[PDB]
């Protein structure tokens, strides 16, 4: 069924599973026309499909050409997401196929279920977790690949860099969600925290800086302070 805090360790067991977040698939800027009406202009998007145990991120770049001449784009975007996730599953060897796909938004349930009818043994589930995966486009290297794309493209990343050499996937996922929540809540402040120190860099093959264990504790504390600070600003607390 649905996935929440009671069955949270389930994310890190040995049953292959993927989170699918469609929040960045269909992206627009809204602007006034010469006649004073309003129009949208689509910009490139992406599907965020993540294995929370391994950190493997299947980033399908959604080029704006896929919307050309199409109607009801916000509805189409859900079905396009389901089509692409289904195509990904079919492209994987059987022993790499997920046993569960967890969608971050309940509106993805029917599109994905319908596209996956050929896979009756893959459970399609919602979650009661509020996951900050919309902030994926605040990760500079992911944003760059999405905005530079001139055609549909799939790019594979490990969103945990090399952290699993030193920490469990439970801890890695917790770190990831803290970082993304901070980037979602105050992107400039979060990026300042992550990059303020010039002596700590991002390896060419990584997404995040090369913090030592003790530095990660400091960073994590600064991110929690940011989130709490923004909560106080928001609610006048």
């Amino acid at each position: 069924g649905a996935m929440n805090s009671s069955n949270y360790a389930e994310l890190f067991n040995n049953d292959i599973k993927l989170f699918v977040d469609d929040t960045n698939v269909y992206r627009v800027t809204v602007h006034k026309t010469f006649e004073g009406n309003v129009a949208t202009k689509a910009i490139n998007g992406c599907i965020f499909t993540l294995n929370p145990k391994t950190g493997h991120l299947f980033l399908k770049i959604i080029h704006t050409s896929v919307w050309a001449g199409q109607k009801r784009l916000s509805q189409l975007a859900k079905w396009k997401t389901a089509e692409e996730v289904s195509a990904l599953v079919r492209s994987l060897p059987k022993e790499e196929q997920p046993k569960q796909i967890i969608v971050t938004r309940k509106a993805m349930l029917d599109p994905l279920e319908v596209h996956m009818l050929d896979f009756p043994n893959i459970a399609i589930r919602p979650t009661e977790l509020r996951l900050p995966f919309s902030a994926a486009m605040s990760i500079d290297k992911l944003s760059d690949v999405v905005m530079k794309a001139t055609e549909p493209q799939m790019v594979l990343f490990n969103i945990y860099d090399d952290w699993l050499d030193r920490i469990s996937s439970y801890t890695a996922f917790s770190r990831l969600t803290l970082l993304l929540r901070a980037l979602k809540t105050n992107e400039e402040s979060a990026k300042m925290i992550l990059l303020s120190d010039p002596t700590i860099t991002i390896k060419s093959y990584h997404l995040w800086p090369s913090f030592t264990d003790e530095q990660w504790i400091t960073i994590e504390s600064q991110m929690r302070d940011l989130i709490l600070t923004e909560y106080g600003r928001k609610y006048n607390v």
Binding site: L76, W79, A82, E83, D110, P111, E113, V114, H115, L117, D118
Partner: protein, 300 residues
């Protein structure tokens, strides 16, 4: 006009005949129902006074044989039987008619209600939904499950309605996932009408039979089937105009006949609101929308 003779009425029982009903007392001198209109299927149904559990009954057509009801004290119910000896049958019916031991089917001349509810219902199709080949009539009861219910348990005692499932490979062509899920026309026209039912008359017959089993027996699986067959049409962008107009008539008479006090258990709010106000056919069922809004505005 034909007749269904009762050996006797040893237990107090409410008897239905089509949309009519009457009470018989324990051991009352009742010997059946006369003046049954030739040309339609009929249903004779029972609810015991001392045990309202199991409504049950028999669909039949007097053109297919001579049928009589006898109470079975072992199985505890009124059973329909066929009498092969026609002269015997005529002699027994004549005696009970002469002694005025029978109720008369009370059809008003103005009244097309039963025709309107059974226009497309034929005994031959009933006997394929209800499988008991040795009898020319068909037993149904409150508790019988459908083939679809038994997939989601005795298969011999099931209602073999056509399985409709909107999230099934049958309903969704590979490569047409969004199209087929949002517009059921493929599933209605190619799979169901051209493929399974062969024509709209057979589709409407099953829909009408499902409604009648829902209403007369409180059969839950039948109510599910009726709603599914409605929703399949309403959720299709492309439906022949004659089908939409006929569906409006079919539903109008069904809603007209439904007992008001059973509307909470016989009508699915989600399906009706979707069909009348959101679906492709929201503006195609003018008669049904008008009666629904005037009779059951709470549901909407």
């Amino acid at each position: 006009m034909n007749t269904v003779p009762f050996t006797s009425a040893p237990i107090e029982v409410t008897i239905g005949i089509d949309q009519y009903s009457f009470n018989v007392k324990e051991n009352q001198p009742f010997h059946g129902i006369k003046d049954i209109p030739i040309g339609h299927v009929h249903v004779i149904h029972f609810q015991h006074a001392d045990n309202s559990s199991m409504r049950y009954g028999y669909w039949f057509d007097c053109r297919m044989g001579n049928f009589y009801i006898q109470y079975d004290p072992k199985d505890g119910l009124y059973k329909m039987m066929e009498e092969r000896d026609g002269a015997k049958f005529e002699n027994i019916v004549h005696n009970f008619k002469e002694r005025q031991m029978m109720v008369s089917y009370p059809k008003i001349d103005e009244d097309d209600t039963w025709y309107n509810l059974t226009e497309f219902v034929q005994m031959d199709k009933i006997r394929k939904i209800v499988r008991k080949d040795e009898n020319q009539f068909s037993y149904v009861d409150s508790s019988m499950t459908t083939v679809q219910e038994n997939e989601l348990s005795d298969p011999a005692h099931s209602l073999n309605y056509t399985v409709i499932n909107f999230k099934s490979r049958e309903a969704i062509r590979p490569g047409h996932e969004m199209e087929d899920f949002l517009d059921k026309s493929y599933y209605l026209n190619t799979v169901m009408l051209q493929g399974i039912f062969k024509n709209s008359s057979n589709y409407f017959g099953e829909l009408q039979f499902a409604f009648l089993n829902a209403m007369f027996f409180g059969n839950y699986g039948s109510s599910l089937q009726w709603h599914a067959m409605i929703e399949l049409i309403c959720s299709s962008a492309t439906v022949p105009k004659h089908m939409l107009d006929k569906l409006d008539e079919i539903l109008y008479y069904q809603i007209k006949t439904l007992p008001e006090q059973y509307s909470d258990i016989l009508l699915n709010e989600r399906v009706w609101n979707i069909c009348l106000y959101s679906s492709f056919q929201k503006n195609s069922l003018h008669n049904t929308e008008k009666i629904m809004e005037n009779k059951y505005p709470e549901l909407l």
